[PDB]
Amino acid sequence: APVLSKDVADIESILALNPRTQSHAALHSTLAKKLDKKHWKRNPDKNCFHCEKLENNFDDIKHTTLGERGALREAMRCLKCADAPCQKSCPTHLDIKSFITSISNKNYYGAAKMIFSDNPLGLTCGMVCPTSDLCVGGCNLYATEEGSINIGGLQQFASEVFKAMNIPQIRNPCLPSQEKMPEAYSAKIALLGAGPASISCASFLARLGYSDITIFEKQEYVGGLSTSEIPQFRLPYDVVNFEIELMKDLGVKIICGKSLSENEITLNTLKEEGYKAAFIGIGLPEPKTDDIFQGLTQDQGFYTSKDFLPLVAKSSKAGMCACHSPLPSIRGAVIVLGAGDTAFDCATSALRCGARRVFLVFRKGFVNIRAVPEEVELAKEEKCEFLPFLSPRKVIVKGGRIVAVQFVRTEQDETGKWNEDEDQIVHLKADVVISAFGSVLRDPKVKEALSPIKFNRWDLPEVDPETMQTSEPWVFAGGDIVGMANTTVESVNDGKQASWYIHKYIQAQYGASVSAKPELPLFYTPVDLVDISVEMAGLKFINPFGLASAAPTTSSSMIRRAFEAGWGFALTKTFSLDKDIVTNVSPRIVRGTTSGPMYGPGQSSFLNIELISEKTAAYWCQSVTELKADFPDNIVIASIMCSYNKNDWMELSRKAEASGADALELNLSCPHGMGERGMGLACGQDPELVRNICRWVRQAVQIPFFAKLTPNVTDIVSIARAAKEGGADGVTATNTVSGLMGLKADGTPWPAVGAGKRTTYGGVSGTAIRPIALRAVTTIARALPGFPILATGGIDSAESGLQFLHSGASVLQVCSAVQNQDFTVIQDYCTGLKALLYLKSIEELQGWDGQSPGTESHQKGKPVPRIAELMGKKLPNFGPYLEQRKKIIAEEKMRLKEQERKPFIPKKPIPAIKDVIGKALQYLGTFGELSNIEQVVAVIDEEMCINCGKCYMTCNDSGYQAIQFDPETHLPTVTDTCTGCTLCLSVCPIIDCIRMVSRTTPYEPKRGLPLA
Amino acid sequence: APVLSKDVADIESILALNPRTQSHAALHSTLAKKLDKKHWKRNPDKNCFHCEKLENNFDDIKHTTLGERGALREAMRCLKCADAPCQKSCPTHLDIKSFITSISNKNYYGAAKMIFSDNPLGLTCGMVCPTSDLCVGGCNLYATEEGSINIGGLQQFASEVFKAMNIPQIRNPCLPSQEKMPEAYSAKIALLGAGPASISCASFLARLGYSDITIFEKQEYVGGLSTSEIPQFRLPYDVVNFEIELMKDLGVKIICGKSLSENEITLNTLKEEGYKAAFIGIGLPEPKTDDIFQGLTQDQGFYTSKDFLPLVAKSSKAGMCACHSPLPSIRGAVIVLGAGDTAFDCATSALRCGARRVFLVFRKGFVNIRAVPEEVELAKEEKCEFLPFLSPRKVIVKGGRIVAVQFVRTEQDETGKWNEDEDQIVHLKADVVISAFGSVLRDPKVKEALSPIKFNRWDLPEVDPETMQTSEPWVFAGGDIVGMANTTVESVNDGKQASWYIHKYIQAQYGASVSAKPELPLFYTPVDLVDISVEMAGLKFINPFGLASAAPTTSSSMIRRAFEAGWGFALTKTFSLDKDIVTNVSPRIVRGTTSGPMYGPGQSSFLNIELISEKTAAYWCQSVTELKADFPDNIVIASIMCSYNKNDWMELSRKAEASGADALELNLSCPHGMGERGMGLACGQDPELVRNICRWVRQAVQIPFFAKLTPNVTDIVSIARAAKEGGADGVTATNTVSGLMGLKADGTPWPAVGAGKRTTYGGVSGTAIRPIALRAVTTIARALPGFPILATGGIDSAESGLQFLHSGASVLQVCSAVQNQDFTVIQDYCTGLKALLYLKSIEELQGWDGQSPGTESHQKGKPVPRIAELMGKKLPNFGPYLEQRKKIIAEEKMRLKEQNAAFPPLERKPFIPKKPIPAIKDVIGKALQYLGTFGELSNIEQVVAVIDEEMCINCGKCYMTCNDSGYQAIQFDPETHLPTVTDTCTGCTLCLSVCPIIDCIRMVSRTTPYEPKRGLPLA
Ligand code: SF4
């Protein structure tokens, strides 16, 4: 027989690139290396002076954009800090900790809800906020080598997913009905300008219940600068439209073609028409001009940022204007005057118009550029040239068009004063000139319409910085027009701030007062109306999430705070009779080593050698009475433990019952410590003992009680059944897994107690034991149908919680997830579960896995271009191949240059918790019930691949050597020797890059040698 | 009574900053926000035009420097790619995949060994390589939002730890003894210039066995440009000294004060003195000059990069020159001409000398700067000004001092040609001028000493690009002198490339030939001599690592490659008699969800519903015969399974024994599939059945055999004991844990088989089950002392392997770690175990935890300054506090400058084992002494948490865990965000467990009387 233990020529060939440790140092001349380097190049070449062509290319260029894979990693990395400095550094005070936590838990709805609650333009800001100067600038992770969290990108991702869900906004469900609202709320309100500031202000007013809000916009388009000037390649117009419609869901009206101006709309005309309040958010409508450009027109090649950017926007933003205008024909050398952030958008936009070269010329130095670094970077990588210390003086015109610009050198002296030497003239060539000197409010017709409000020295309407109120009580202003805000988020905040005092003003005009403490409503949608209550063993839970008997329930004061946060129920730490009082050792709770040396947020497990509660039964019983008195709707379950003694169990259970506990939990599963005292596992591993203890309790009390089972047994069903036979109303599955978390290199354990550095087997908790808990819950559910199960073991999100519900559990206990964070996670779990149930009724989102959209082919989270000349060309994203892709993409843009949002409606009833419990059991069975004829094979999407070769290595040393890994393109190809083991898909770093599909060829197992 | 379920005022107060979900939108005016922002500011202010004072500040400014915490995260993130593009993009071809894998496995020694094997200046390069234009430029992770891997920083970290280990280099232990080396190896070899190129060349020649190698260096210092010009704030001189000493460990000699010149050393004098070969690595010793600077001196304020940088270096690098060197007094405006990478080091160095302002003036545009971006950024963040399109023409001097420089405008025409308008003159003020136009070789006395080698039109010695050989057969050249290399790493490669052909040349001169395939030796140290063999049940294992019976052993051809890679032993996939032939389903192996939505490298677990081998017993038995025939020293264990039938077990075991297997493994633990056919989990949970099966096998065969136990039982010791009573020679602990990995939101499972999307309980493997496996191994070891244990369950490194050895196991089976990577991990496991055993004999490194140094107070991996005026000042690293810290640090630098206290020497000495290196047999079971009952633990030796404020990153996680999961014992300052553990601490240890900074929080003995809180008094 051939040499069986040896690879034939063909396999040896397929394994050519499989890693093998070298026995000697490598030998490759410096010349050979220089010639080989360019083939694998991924990033920009520092020696390349050009860059691809960007004409008519408006694809997203943001470095912060994230796909799901990337967002999940970055969200998990976030420390989710207390009193977070990032939130303090956010103009709209977004609870960054909460929304990022929701993202890491895959609860995109909850994340978006939190974002929009404080920022009505959440998506826009996620995309355009100059974070390095705001939230990200204060991020604690800046103190790590990996750096600060990409907050903007994460905000953008959650908001994008929400937008894709097509869920509308609704008024707070707690507000009185429309007709029951006081008369004051029907007061006519007017807002001028449809920009971030007015959109924000009108949104909050609408949240408060005002039913007659109207925004008067001068232009035919809405959104202000977010629409008219911010480039499409930074902020898609589609985003603006999304946020505008969300506002309209609250009844806000918008009327375009209406301007604030003398003989148009004025404060007087509004007052005479009955309007009770007005908000001014018209921004700075005019370009800051300069003498030297007088008479210059566009025909000659001159523009101000106010002239240029809107032209590019109208041409590149579909939906902005009814008319499809041409892209400004910019050819030759372009000069952008100024170093502000607007100048850089002019420079980058110029390139899209066909500019051959773009020069940014400013009167100060490089160090004086005050534009956000991230913005400056975009212009720099697109090869814009920078010319410092030059002040414009003349725009030389010859032939009816600009041919150059004359400058004069500038310089700083000692005192730090700037001088411009008039003798040193500079001649710069240029076919087009764009001034980006800023914007202002000059139009006398407009200023006049604001009479008689007071203006300050800046020639801008004066307002109280806290109330946003002008000299005229009923008139407020905010945004660019006030001159303080420098960003979209600050403008949104101005409108937000104003909304509260406009509310206060209006209510007072009707003789009504408002709360002393500001109460702007949060953001709501129909998802928030979803009922997640559940009944079990005769008990009613407002939600299925509760605190397990553990460290988070060390004290009853903590349970009170958990209930105040919103937890449906809670277990007391396990307590006992005075004679069984315990004393803990220290250290006793350590982090898991189950997922490597990863510290901080999201520990994959914990190990503890803690005993039951150190507090007395008297303390616990009095505490339960207090808790039930103050929180009658929150379920309190008393966890108790006794040795194998009938009188003790009856005494303690009755004492607990008399205190008012809704139910009891019998701790028959402590994996350490209590066992030596004749309790815990010893009693919980023997069906007979479990049965008798339950009988003793059943006979002692009338309230329901549940037996908490240990997973450390051969057959957990036998003890679950014993509990049922004994009279238990259900079982809690499960307690911690017995284990040893590890040793230091010197052999000592952790935890290590005392000078002797001793330890004992502890209990493992967390996500690392979830597979064990899920198996336990499902086996019990299948064996004892209908028998109440309280799940516990690795529940850290609505998503994982739903898994246990589907597995047969009715309620969900949590410990480790709280130890990893805090009690506020309940907000995430509830909004998350509501969203998951809501989405099950949306027919158009059935291709989604929970809150996750179906993964689309992408690279760096950005969708891959669907150009015919690119598909199936084996062009990886590196080296000469990358160069070809760019050439094809640019070509496509030139070719293209040559050529309604509706909410989804539930088409079926939203399921209730009772409708989903146990629905997964139908898929579970024996191995024999699985089909061995319906085989699958792996198929790789070459467009999503990042060429790492992990699929290849896993199949080579852990599989069937079925993958070909190209030595030039580093692209893998699954051949037909694939057996569908699925390991390659399991190790792939790109989510859904590899998928398992039905095998079309006949499957035949490899026997190595024929059978007889 | 008081309301027990309520927090008293004091606690409510301590909980002030504890997170609580808001019921309404927040309200904070834009003005209020603007005023609050600066208090929490971490990064540079885009509105601030001046960077803190840097006079005499030579602290590390590299953004790529990593501490252990950061290195482990970045190493774990690396994809560890096949045929890695980063390696292809590295001039020395470092096996980046391997060394980063070693780092993620905490095997810093193995990482360093791999690095130095291909690059003798591994640490230097890690710190200075312009990676964006090299290795990192080709990193696949560039295609992800998080970006490319910080390869240089990881290389630097591993190399730094190795440096701290103070382990010397030794010649390959396989080379013949010195006296038995052929005469050819005693040939006198000479190298000119002690720079990267010569150091590399001499190192490899020494590795090959040459015993008479001498480097002649012109200056009194060694290291070349790494020493004389690269700033101390980018490359500490002691890094250079470290690498020089490693080279000297191989006998290489260095003689300073000897120059290659017409007056001293020439090719002719060397030839007449008997030298058989020479390597020229003198670089480009002279500055590129320009007529307009004729006559200008330092006194007036003029310097070339060649004049300036060496002065700053001699003054800031302790150990470079023994004499005292005054820091160049540079005050006023400084002009650096040029935009090359040297210009930027001149600019940043000028600031350290006292420059008030530094301007970089270049004749082309910003887009034309060809210096690596990372270098440009350093100058930019330190506020250096940039002036483009300006070409120097005249230097104005008054009072014997420079006062200005005259330039002329430049620009490109439509043809791409550069022009300089002579009419547009520019007057720029300046007190100091530094030209950084490059370097060259012009000295006729030096060029003459190279006669008669041929020079090319670049006026540089001509060499064959592949052999590095000049027109004179015995003379080779490399590095800057050749004009191709632009980096330290390329210069190192030039010397590396030349060493092989110099070797070939010399051998040929003695009538000997060399292998057709280049065989430059790897890097070796005494650690490599450590014996990691072990004996168990009469079997001899060359190393304790082996492949578990699993996917990695699906085919015997895979086992062959694993043995070729170096694995000590391997198990065949479990096989059975023909009548019990199985057929797998698909999908059947999925990634674990045990550590969240983290994909790619290092999955924390896998779940499988795979059955035993689909290949026949005939295939397996023939395969074992073949494997044992070709690898007699590698242990092969045949895994077999039968239903509860005596004849079957005896038939199969005998068939396996006859094939030549060293031993057998009885699979009595498959947690799924086989149970239905009456095997695996069925028979392995009952002590009686286990005992009988072992008895049947014991009487059927004579070779040793082990029972593979399942962890899915109440008492694993009962099964293990049953196996021992049945005659088993040992047990394998353990097989996979029974579980369900999860469901999709629609309720369907994964894996899901068929259109019905069905599944069944599978087996969990990987690090997620290690706690269960460790417990199993320790409990069996304590109950049955001396009984052989083969460990399996989450072993993915030498470190984790050592934990199982310490727990009682003799050998280590691996599966998931290979599924997560490949067979080469064996190299990491072996070097790692050798290092861990070696370190146990080094007395001066007892404060280390294995290969991990004790954690020093740091921020971003950089040691915190020990200035008195900073300690205990509650100055966090943000906002106005950060401003204060910088002010204090700058003052300290000025204070240290006034001292002119000639820097202390530098004597590097190797640590010597002061006790025998333990063998595997000496560590087995050594951890059992610390294990016991809960009652054996002391409840009087309590501890409390103590936080090092200097390492804290102010996240408040310790605060939040103690609040909602602890005892509300931590105060979190609302202004500094600094936590303080109070006396109410109970030492639960949760805060330390969730802290993101390794060792920021430590548990220390409680000094106050500990008293449990009862809530209510006892009666
Ligand atoms: S050891 Fe425990 S009681 Fe002490 S400050 Fe840390 S979480 Fe709180």
DSSP letters of B710-727? -S-SS-HHHHHHHHHHTT
Neighbours of A178 (CB within 10 A): 12
For residues B526 and B543, membership in a common domain is answered with no
**Gaps in chain B following residue numbers (C to N > 2.5 A):** none
Give Cα B185 distance to the centre of its chain: 35
Angle at B390 between CA B386 and CA B394, to 5 degrees: 115
For residues A167 and A47, membership in a common domain is answered with yes
Residue located via tokens 């060496």: B310
Q: Residue B500, SS3? A: helix
Q: Are A475 and A278 contacting, i.e. CB atoms less than 8 angstroms apart?
A: yes
A496:B27 CB<8 A: yes
Q: How many CA atoms lie within 13 A of A982 on its CB side?
A: 27
Q: What are phi and psi of B116, to 5 degrees?
A: -65, -20
Q: Are B751 and B760 contacting, i.e. CB atoms less than 8 angstroms apart?
A: no
Residue A897 included in any domain? no
* CA–CA dist A540, A852 (Å, integer): 31
Beta strands in B952-992 (DSSP E): 970-972, 979-981
The identity of residue A387, as a single letter, is: L
The identity of residue A901, as a single letter, is: R
The residues, ordered by sequence, that sit 6+ positions from A511 with a Cβ below 8 Å of its Cβ are none
What are the beta bridge partners of residue B254?
Answer: B215
Q: Are B650 and B697 contacting, i.e. CB atoms less than 8 angstroms apart?
A: yes
* CA–CA dist B68, B1000 (Å, integer): 13
HEC readout, A629-673 = HHCCCCEEEEEECCCCCHHHHHHHHHHHHHCCCCEEEEECCCCCC
Nearest to B750 by CA among B931, B606, B595, B634: B606
For residues B522 and B539, membership in a common domain is answered with no
Q: What is the dihedral of CA A367, A372, A376, A377, to 10 degrees?
A: 110
The residues, ordered by sequence, that sit 6+ positions from A224 with a Cβ below 8 Å of its Cβ are A193, A194, A195, A196, A197, A283
The identity of residue B54, as a single letter, is: L
Residue located via tokens 């009548």: B579
Residue-by-residue DSSP string for A812-831? EEESHHHHTS-TTHHHHHHH
Four-residue CA torsion sign, A875, A876, A880, A883? positive
Residue B887 included in any domain? no
Nearest to A946 by CA among B741, B318, B143, B435: B143
Residue B339 included in any domain? yes
Q: Are B678 and B580 contacting, i.e. CB atoms less than 8 angstroms apart?
A: no
Four-residue CA torsion sign, A241, A118, A477, A375? negative
Cis peptide before B452 (omega within 30 of 0): yes
Q: Are B694 and B726 contacting, i.e. CB atoms less than 8 angstroms apart?
A: yes
Determine contact: B519 vs chain A, CB below 8 A: yes
Residue B668 included in any domain? yes
Pocket lining: B995 vs ligand 1, CB cutoff 6 Å: no
Residue of B nearest to A768 (CA): B594
* CA–CA dist B136, A37 (Å, integer): 11
For residues B512 and B461, membership in a common domain is answered with yes
Cis peptide before A601 (omega within 30 of 0): no
Cis peptide before A734 (omega within 30 of 0): yes
Residue B886 included in any domain? no
A503: left (phi over 0), alpha (psi -120 to 50) or beta: alpha
The identity of residue B664, as a single letter, is: L
B167: its two tokens: 């382990």
Cα A836 to Cα A160, A839, B371, B747, B866: the distances in Å are 17, 5, 53, 12, 53
Nearest to B768 by CA among B744, B805, B736: B736
Give Cα B982 distance to the centre of its chain: 38
The identity of residue B483, as a single letter, is: G
The residues, ordered by sequence, that sit 6+ positions from A857 with a Cβ below 8 Å of its Cβ are A863, A864, A941, A943, A944
Put the strands of the sheet holding B253-256 in their side by side order. B253-256, B213-217, B189-192, B277-280, B475-477
* CA–CA dist A632, A52 (Å, integer): 67
For residues B242 and B349, membership in a common domain is answered with no
Residue A324 included in any domain? yes
Residue located via tokens 């029951």: A180
Cα B748 to Cα A82, A405, A634, A964, A980: the distances in Å are 37, 69, 32, 32, 19
For residues B170 and B279, membership in a common domain is answered with no
Q: Are A104 and A76 contacting, i.e. CB atoms less than 8 angstroms apart?
A: yes
Residue of minimum CA distance from atom 3 in ligand 1: B985
What are the beta bridge partners of residue B608?
Answer: B589, B763
Give Cα A580 distance to the centre of its chain: 48
Residue B901 included in any domain? no
Question: B65 labelled as ligand-binding?
Answer: no
For residues B718 and B833, membership in a common domain is answered with yes
B642: its two tokens: 């039968």
The identity of residue B674, as a single letter, is: M
Cα B72 to Cα A602, A816, B104, B106, B158: the distances in Å are 16, 24, 5, 8, 10
- End-to-end, the C-alpha distance of chain A in Å comes to 15
Four-residue CA torsion sign, B309, B311, B312, B316? positive
* CA–CA dist B188, B202 (Å, integer): 12
Residue A885 included in any domain? no
Q: Which helix (H) or strand (E) holds A422?
A: strand A418-429
**In angstroms, what is the resolution?**
2.2
A416: left (phi over 0), alpha (psi -120 to 50) or beta: left
A760:B620 CB<8 A: no
A88:B40 CB<8 A: yes
Residues of chain A neighbouring B962 (CB-CB closer than 8 A): none
Pocket lining: B979 vs ligand 1, CB cutoff 6 Å: no
Domain boundary, last residue among B504, B531, B558: B531
Q: Could you say which of B384, B621, B642, B670 is catalytic?
A: B670
Q: Tell me how many residue pairs between chain A and chain B have CB atoms under 8 A apart.
A: 863
For residues A658 and A708, membership in a common domain is answered with yes
For residues B543 and B650, membership in a common domain is answered with yes
Q: Are B254 and B218 contacting, i.e. CB atoms less than 8 angstroms apart?
A: no
* CA–CA dist A426, B108 (Å, integer): 59
B972:A82 CB<8 A: yes
Nearest to B154 by CA among B39, B213, B67, B280: B67
* CA–CA dist B593, A431 (Å, integer): 60
Task: Supply the DSSP symbol for A180.
Answer: G
For residues A540 and A649, membership in a common domain is answered with yes
Q: How many domains does chain B have?
A: 5
- Domain of residue A650 covers 532-843
* CA–CA dist A873, A868 (Å, integer): 9
Give Cα B152 distance to the centre of its chain: 9
Residues of chain A neighbouring B878 (CB-CB closer than 8 A): 85, 138, 143
Counting runs of H as helices and runs of E as strands, what totals does chain B give?
A: 30, 35
For residues A123 and A253, membership in a common domain is answered with no
The rounded Å distance from CA A673 to ligand 1 centre is 21
Q: Are B8 and B1013 contacting, i.e. CB atoms less than 8 angstroms apart?
A: no
A696: its two tokens: 């003793």
3-state helix, strand, coil in chain B (%, to 5): 35, 15, 50
Neighbours of A1 (CB within 10 A): 9
* CA–CA dist B666, B735 (Å, integer): 11
What are the beta bridge partners of residue A391?
Answer: A408
* CA–CA dist B998, A249 (Å, integer): 49
HEC readout, B3-19 = CCCCCCHHHHHHCCCCC
The rounded Å distance from CA B978 to ligand 1 centre is 15
The length of chain B is 1019
Cis peptide before B587 (omega within 30 of 0): yes
Cα A616 to Cα A610, A662, B372: the distances in Å are 16, 19, 68
* Strand-pair category, A432-435 with A333-337: parallel
**Ranges of H-type helices in B726-843:** 770-783, 798-806, 816-819, 825-839
Angle at B957 between CA B952 and CA B959, to 5 degrees: 95
Cα B201 to Cα B197, B475, B476: the distances in Å are 6, 13, 10
Long-range contacts of A310-313 (CB under 8 A, 24+ apart): A310/A228, A310/A229, A312/A231, A312/A349, A312/A352, A312/A353, A313/A227, A313/A228, A313/A229, A313/A230, A313/A231, A313/A232, A313/A237
* CA–CA dist B61, B59 (Å, integer): 6
Neighbours of B853 (CB within 10 A): 15
Pocket lining: B969 vs ligand 1, CB cutoff 6 Å: yes
Cα B497 to Cα B464, B482, B500, B615, B875: the distances in Å are 11, 13, 6, 48, 52
Q: How many CA atoms lie within 13 A of A555 on its CB side?
A: 22
Burial class (CB in 10 A: 0-12, 13-18, 19+), A74: buried
Domain boundary, last residue among B810, B843, B876: B843
The identity of residue B216, as a single letter, is: F
Q: What are phi and psi of A165, to 5 degrees?
A: -70, -20
Residue located via tokens 């103590």: B946
CATH number of A1012's domain: 3.30.70.20
Q: What are phi and psi of B943, to 5 degrees?
A: -130, 165
Determine contact: A714 vs chain B, CB below 8 A: yes
A754:B938 CB<8 A: yes
CATH number of A172's domain: 1.10.1060.10
Neighbours of A6 (CB within 10 A): 15
Q: Which helix (H) or strand (E) holds A115?
A: helix A108-118
CATH number of A197's domain: 3.50.50.60
HEC readout, A938-1005 = EEECCCCCCCCCHHHHHHHHHCCCCEEECCCCCCEEECCCCCCCCHHHHHCCCCCCEEEEECCCCCCC
Burial class (CB in 10 A: 0-12, 13-18, 19+), B274: exposed
* CA–CA dist B418, B416 (Å, integer): 7
Cα A860 to Cα A131, A153, A348: the distances in Å are 20, 12, 22
The identity of residue B786, as a single letter, is: G
Residue-by-residue DSSP string for B546-586? EE-SSGGGSSHHHHHHHHHHT-SEEEPPPB--GGG-----S
* CA–CA dist B228, B315 (Å, integer): 11
Residue located via tokens 């893998």: A972
* CA–CA dist B42, A258 (Å, integer): 45
Give Cα A17 distance to the centre of its chain: 38
Cα A70 to Cα A73, A132, B47, B474: the distances in Å are 5, 20, 31, 56
Residues of chain B neighbouring A387 (CB-CB closer than 8 A): 388-389
Burial class (CB in 10 A: 0-12, 13-18, 19+), A782: middle
* CA–CA dist A802, A461 (Å, integer): 54
Task: Report B:566-585 residues touching A (Cβ under 8 A).
Answer: 566, 578, 581, 583-585
Neighbours of A11 (CB within 10 A): 16
Largest Cα–Cα distance of chain B, in whole Å?
Answer: 109
Q: Could you say which of A384, A670, A694, A830 is catalytic?
A: A670
Question: A274 labelled as ligand-binding?
Answer: no
For residues A62 and A3, membership in a common domain is answered with no
Domain boundary, last residue among A182, A210, A227: A182
* CA–CA dist A904, A925 (Å, integer): 36
